[PDB]
Every structure is written in C-alpha cells, then in structure tokens.
Nucleic acid binder design. Structure first.
Lengths: 129, 81, 150, 155, 168
RNA sequence: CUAGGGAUCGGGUGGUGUUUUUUUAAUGACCCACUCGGCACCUUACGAGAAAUCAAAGUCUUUGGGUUCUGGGGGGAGUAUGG
RNA sequence: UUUCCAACGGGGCCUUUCCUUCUGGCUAACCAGGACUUUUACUUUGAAAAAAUUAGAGUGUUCAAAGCAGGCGUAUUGCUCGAAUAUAUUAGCAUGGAAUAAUAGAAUAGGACGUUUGGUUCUAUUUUGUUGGUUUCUAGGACCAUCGUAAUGAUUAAUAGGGACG
C-alpha cells in the first residue's frame, strides 16, 4: 500500500538522485504532491517539472540540476505553533542561513519562513534540499 | 534519459513491454470485424475470445476458446483495422 | 499483493485515455442499451451475460458505449439479483468445498480453504451492509452457504 | 407505556398553579403553559399541542438553560425519559506531541416531546441538578438518518 | 437575427450569414426535421489576430446527439458565405444552497475541452511548470478533418474559461 | 528503485527463420527477441555493518512509507512464586 | 522632497473567478432585516491566567548578595524622579484562516433555480366602532393534482483487492 503517496514520492527521487538520475516517473501523484513540487520548483532546489496525465493517478517528470541532496516526509504530520517551527529548524536543518522545512496550512502550502512572513504556522510536511 | 523528456524518447522501445509499464497505458490486443462462411454477416468476436461462436445461420461452432487468444474455425476473411 | 493467498498477480483489464466511442463502432447508445436489455431478460448472472454477449456481438463493455452499468441496468428492469454476482459465486465455492467436506472427513486443506472463502464472504457481507445493498438483519451463515446457490 | 391522560403515577401530573377553569366552559379548551427555552431554540410542536407534563422539560416544566451546551450521539435509551450521550475527543500528550482517543458518558434527561433512537445526534443544555448524574436536558434533536421512509422503493 | 427555426431564444446576430436559420427548412427533406427543433443561446465573436473572429455559438446540451452527424458538414457551410470568420459550437455545463461534486468548476470545461473539434478524442494533459503556465495537453487521432488546421484560433479559445500541437 | 547476466520453469508470440515431415518455420523443438510467475546464482559494493558478509542484514546523525511482538552487563535464571 | 529603468505586497474590478439575494436611512459608504459557496479535527489574533520565584532598565546598599530605593540647589523654610515588561500549552470562551484529515448531499430526482397555479395548517399588527362568540381578502413557512427551470444527479476502474469464464 502507498499510505502516503507523498512518501512514495521523493524516496523514489532519493532512489533516483542517490543512484544518479536526472528524472523519475512518479505514479501515483496528487495535488498534495503537485503543489509540493511547485513549492520546490519555486525554491529551485529541483528544476523544471511537468505533470503528464491519464484517466488514472498521473505522472510527473522532473528536470533538476543536482541540488536536491535529500528530502523526506516528516510523517506523522505534526501540528506546529508559531514559536515551535524554530524548534523543528535546529533539529533537522543544515545551517541557519538556508534550508527549508515546508508546511501544509490553512493558507495552503509554503515553507516555514513564509509561514513566519505571512504569520501562521500549520501542519508539517517535509524537509527539502 | 541524459537530456530528453519522456515525452521525447525512442518511442517503440517500451511499446511491447507489458501494456501498463509503458509511458501511458495502452491495451495489447485488437478488434476484428469478420464474416462467417455461413452467412457473410460481419460477426465481431473478440481476439482473446472466451465464447464458442455458434453461427448466425448454421449451428456450427466456428471457434474454439484457448488462453492467450482463441482458436477460430478456418474460413474467416480478415482485413485491416 | 493478494489477501489470503501469499502470491503476486496481474489479471489485466487496462483502459487507455479516451472515454467516448473512438473510431469505428457504428451503433447508437440506444442500440447497445437495448442489446443489453435483450441480454438481461435471459435470466442469468451478470458475469454470464458479459462473458458471452460482450464477446459475440461486438459489444465493447457495458459502460463505454452503453452508459449505464449492469447492476444499474437490472434494477431499472425488475430483474435485479438477490445477492449480486460475486458473493453468490463465493457461496458457490463454499458449496463445492462443503460438499467435498463430507465426501471425505479428513481433507485438512479443505478446512483451510473454507476459512479463506468464509472470511471473504464476511467482508463482502459487511461491505454490502455498509452501503446498504444487503439488508443488515440477515447474517451470512454456513447453514445458508449450501442451500442458497443449489 | 405512560398512556396520555398521563396520570399513571399515584399523583396527578399537571402544570403547577395552572388552573383549568371549571365554572366557565367556553371555546378555550386548552390551558397549557409553555415557555421559550432561550438561546434561539425552536420549541417542539408536541410541547405546544401535547398532554404530557414532564416537570423537567425545558419547554413546559420548571427547569432552565444556562452556561453549557453539548453535542454528541445517543446511546442506551433503555431508561425512562432520559438518554446517555457519549462525547469522543482527543486528549493531548506533549511527551510524544500526539493525541489519544477518549470518550465521556453524559447522562442527560430527554423530553417526551422529542422521540429518539440509539445513534442519533443530540444537543443538550445545562440545567439545575436533576439527579446524581444528570445536569443536562435534551433540547435539540438533529437526527441525520438519511430519509429511509420509502428509499428501499428504489429505481 | 430574427426569423424562424429556433424556439425563440434570440441574439442580435443570427441572420446575416445563416440561411441555415431561414432556408435549410427549404432545401432539406429530413435535415428539416433535424435543424428546426434545435436552439442556441447566444453568439459571441472573438478576435484572434488577423481580424479573425470565432463565433462561440452557445448551443444547449440537448442538441449534440444528432448534431454530431451534421457538424461534419455545417462548420464549412458558413465558410461558404462569410470567410475569415469562424464557427465553433459550444455547450453549457453545470457548475457544482446544496451543490454536488461530480462536474464542479473545471469539469464544467472538461467537456468544453474536447468540443472544439470532432470526432477524434483525447490522449491527455502534459502540463508544464515554468514552461500551469503554458499547459500542454495532447490528443491521439484516427483522422484529420477539423483538427490540425483551424487550431490556431482554438489556442485563443479555451484557456480563459487539448492544446493545439498534435503529432497526428 | 537500482543493479548485471546466461539459464531455468508456468504462460503468451511467430521472423521471405533452420531441419524428420501436415507440406521451408508441423506433433514437439529450435537461433534471434519479448512479456509477466517461482527457484537460484555471481560481479563491482553506490549503501551499509565492528566484522564474517549482505542487491538487501539498503534509500538511518543528510536520522519519520504503514503496522505487530520482543531486548537492556554477566550470571543467579527461564530459577522461585503466582495466574 | 521634482523623480526615468525594474523589483518585493494585498485590495476596487475584470478575461463563466457568485464577489449573492435584502431594502427605510439612499439615490450598499455603512447600519436592522431571510439563506450562507455544509459540521468536527487544525491553526491564527484577544481574554483569563494571584502576589512571591525566573529575565531586565534605573538606583555608588562604598562594589555587591541584597533593596525598590530616591536625587537637587539661594537649604531663604523648599523643589522633585519612581516603584516597568517578558512569560505560563491542553480544558473552557470569542473570529478569520481556507490546505490537511474527516463527514457527503442531487440516483427516487418522493430535490434544487419554482420569481408557478387549484387545494391543506393557517391567520389579526390590524383597519373593523370602544373591548370578547361570526368571518374574509390577507404579512410568513410546507406538499399532493401539476408543469413552465438553467448548464437538471452516476469524480475513477488502481503497476490495491473480490467474482466469472478461458
């Protein structure tokens, strides 16, 4: 079972990048994963990607430039206050002056500093670089 | 794989590789619109048939069902698509 | 991954992208609907309907050129089955296993093979009590799993 | 059960101090005191046009509504003129940043104006203490069965 | 813009081109019985570059089943009278008080997606991101009879409310 | 998800495909290809492990796909006691 | 601060992006008035969170630990600074936020857009003539006879399972 399609996402791109690819075929995929990857392309850790479609789940193809070292889901999807995101920074991020945990929230999906900017904090999704 | 999108591969490389593993899904088998030697009425049996066709004029069993695809009785005119 | 079997399997019916009648089949929807209504009043289970007269009359499926699926067809006709198609034939498997259970008493795999079928009938009875297509007063029982098919 | 002409008890159930006038007999023929419950509650039309009494009904009797109002689902209507609801919720533990399923049973008096079933959805309000367990009284029945009156007569 | 064969749902432009609205109940034995019941709501001309307007004919839903058997013939029979203008028949679908799920707000124009052309269906969305910006979506086909040549106005038709590169 | 392979066996196909012979490729079986099922092997180990070794005993300090049962130094001891 | 080139923000509005209906102040700026483009889980801003502890101005208690104390001239009969804030999740109480998870409408269409029409429960702020037995038209809900309404309801057939048949 693919209990989290978002988990049997980027683990696939771990098994592509650590094994040295430039793309992988992600199926299934959701708007969870679609907006997740739009956020990642907006940060530009990964590069250009395309959603191709069937009358089934759907596929995504990514064209990065290497800078995706590691991502991962932080399942279970913990619910975080404003001051407590910075706890989650120093546990599992490389340095202060880069690196993004991202969040799903009632303001959609954005990293924890846009949460600091647009002044909410919501449920965890993953850590991305 | 190096630099090509997978809308832009060598196309037919994965085309026979077990229908659903291809870049999208497309079924294996085919349709046939053929006519019996007893009526010359177009009797569309499926390629991978599971039903032994009694003729529409005769009572002749004009196919024998087998796995994979079925085994017709000879006398069926074929044509393309 | 199979339940109750410990094996891997792919029994394929895959569907390409396009929805409507694509290229060649020249009948209207009314023609194939009245064909399926002809098939439906023959008084057999929907497996036996499809396996014969999707294969002998050029019918693609009962959903693409037709529009209304088969258990929706029979309930608009008054010939909707009691327990639809698959719980009945799993009770038929239970019939076969339980009639071989007293041909010989110590067929020990038959004690193991009834449990899997009985468990899947429990799940199907529970799912058909979920969406309320089975009446939730009756319960499946081995004292009704050999007098209800044949 | 109770057999309206509701005085199956040893003592005449009536509205206290409400006085059906026996000398003058005229086109009144219904002296039934009822109150609003407060808080925007539609009164049940049984209570306007009923013969039951129920001292602890929030629409006809000497109780009141205050402070708390609570949702939940029914269970175990096998008592008389009262139900028990059970509220589920998620306790929190910060050792693990996680939750925990718990439930609480509230024994809440029910009116005869409403008629319920084990599995409906209730909304109750706090009242003065009625018995040991009971501090609540059923005031809105949001039954969400799904209209199975003739739903089996289906196409 | 007046006369006959509709059930009187008028717009201010019906009859300057449409002898099909007046005089194809006169040149038809049984297309008489086909065109005369049909309605259409409104007519929008839409400018695409070259002074090239497309007429979004707001045909209702119950005029698509037998209209497919005349859309092969009628889309060029207004190309016989007015040229450098174009005819595209659109239908109107429900947006989904109490509202259901099935055909919500983009599945409204999912059946306004295949119905720029006819009859070769679809093969799928191929949506690009930084070139949801340009939004590739393709077809597969059997034939070419109104695909592959009038599509460069159809690019400007759709994506405001099967994007038009198709390798046969 | 990735290696990389010549075979296996259970199925599916027939090359202007080679021979007994249904009649060049029939019964069957083949070289060249292709598919999913079971049993295996060995390579450089990218990843590990303390190490023998492991294509999983991986994708874990760059620590979180889901779920179940155990272990906390050696003994005393799977002993006493109780269920 | 006159300000040419681009860049970070949300809004008035618009390319079916309903952003609603409701009208006295009115000729929607915003105030009463009938329904929300569903209810919980989540989170954001207030409020409650005793004082004493913990963090810190300022104060030469001789530095301090302390303490909330105190400083200034013609000392001419007086002048005059203070004794902050930070914090404390669940539970409880208020509102958005519009993902996540949940709960599913409209498969009878015995339902919505019904601006429709016989008929049912109705009806007195009333005007009736001052107040109560006898009434209507009538403001405000529901459906059968009943059809006019826009675009009238089947999100998939899963490289997840259950059947049939070969």
């Amino acid at each position: 079972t693919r209990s989290s399609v978002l988990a049997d996402a980027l683990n696939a791109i771990n098994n592509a990048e650590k094994t040295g690819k430039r793309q992988v075929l992600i199926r299934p995929s959701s708007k969870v994963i679609i907006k997740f990857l739009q956020v990642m392309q907006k940060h530009g850790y990964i590069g250009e990607f395309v959603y191709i479609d069937d009358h089934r789940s759907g596929k995504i193809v990514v064209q990065l430039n290497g800078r995706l070292n590691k991502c991962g889901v932080i399942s279970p999807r913990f619910n975080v206050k404003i001051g407590d995101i910075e706890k989650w920074t120093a546990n599992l991020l490389p340095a202060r002056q880069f690196g993004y945990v991202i969040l799903t929230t009632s303001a959609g999906i954005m990293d924890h500093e846009e949460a600091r900017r647009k002044h909410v904090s919501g449920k965890i999704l993953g850590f991305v670089y | 794989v190096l630099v090509q999108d997978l809308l832009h591969p060598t196309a037919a490389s994965e085309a026979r590789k077990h229908k659903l593993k291809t870049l999208v899904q497309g079924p294996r088998s085919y349709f046939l619109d053929v006519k019996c030697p007893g009526c010359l009425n177009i009797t569309t049996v499926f390629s991978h048939a599971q039903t032994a066709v009694t003729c529409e004029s005769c009572s002749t069993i004009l196919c024998t069902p087998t796995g994979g695809k079925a085994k017709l009785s000879e006398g069926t005119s074929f044509r393309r698509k | 991954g199979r339940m109750h079997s410990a094996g891997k399997g792919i029994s394929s019916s895959a569907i390409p992208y396009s929805r409507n009648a694509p290229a060649w089949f020249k009948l209207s929807s009314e023609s194939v609907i009245e064909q399926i209504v002809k098939y439906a009043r023959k008084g057999l289970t929907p497996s036996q309907i499809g396996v014969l007269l999707r294969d002998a009359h050029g019918v693609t499926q009962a959903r693409v050129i037709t529009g209304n699926k088969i258990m929706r067809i029979l309930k608009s006709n008054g010939l909707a089955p009691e327990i639809p198609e698959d719980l009945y034939y799993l009770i038929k498997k239970a019939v076969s296993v339980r009639k071989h259970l007293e041909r010989n008493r110590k067929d020990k795999d038959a004690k193991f093979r009834l449990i899997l079928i009985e468990s899947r009938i429990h799940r199907l009875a529970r799912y058909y009590r979920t969406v309320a297509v089975l009446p939730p007063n009756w319960k499946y029982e081995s004292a009704t799993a050999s007098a209800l098919v044949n | 059960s109770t057999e309206l002409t509701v005085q199956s008890e040893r003592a005449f159930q009536k509205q206290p101090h409400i006085f059906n006038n026996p000398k003058v007999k005229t086109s009144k023929r219904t002296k039934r005191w009822y109150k609003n419950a407060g808080l925007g509650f539609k009164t049940p039309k049984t209570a306007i046009e009923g013969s039951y009494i129920d001292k602890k009904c929030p629409f006809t009797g000497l109780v009141s509504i205050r402070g708390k109002i609570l949702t939940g689902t029914v269970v175990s209507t096998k008592m008389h003129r009262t139900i028990v609801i059970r509220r589920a919720y998620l306790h929190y533990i910060p050792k693990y940043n996680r939750y925990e399923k718990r439930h609480k049973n509230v024994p809440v008096h029910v009116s005869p104006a409403f008629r319920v079933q084990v599995g409906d959805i209730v909304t109750v309000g706090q009242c003065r203490p009625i018995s040991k367990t009971v501090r609540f009284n059923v005031v809105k029945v949001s039954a969400a069965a799904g209209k199975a009156n003739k739903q089996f007569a289906k196409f | 813009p007046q006369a006959k064969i509709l059930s009187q749902a008028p717009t201010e432009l019906e009859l300057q081109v449409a002898q099909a609205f007046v005089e194809l109940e006169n040149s038809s034995p049984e297309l008489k019985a086909e065109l005369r019941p049909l309605q259409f709501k409104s007519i929008r001309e839409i400018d695409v570059a070259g002074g090239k307007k497309a007429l979004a004919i707001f045909v209702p839903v119950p005029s698509l089943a037998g209209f497919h058997k005349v859309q092969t013939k009628l889309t060029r029979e207004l190309e016989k009278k007015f040229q450098d203008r174009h005819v595209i028949f659109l239908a109107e679908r429900r947006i989904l008080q109490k509202r259901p799920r099935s055909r919500t707000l983009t599945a409204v124009h999912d059946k306004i997606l295949e119905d720029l052309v006819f009859p070769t269906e679809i093969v799928g969305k191929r949506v690009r991101y930084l070139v949801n910006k340009i939004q590739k979506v393709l077809l597969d086909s059997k034939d070419v009879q109104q695909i592959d040549y009038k599509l460069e106005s159809f690019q400007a038709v759709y994506n405001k409310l099967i994007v038009f590169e198709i390798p046969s």
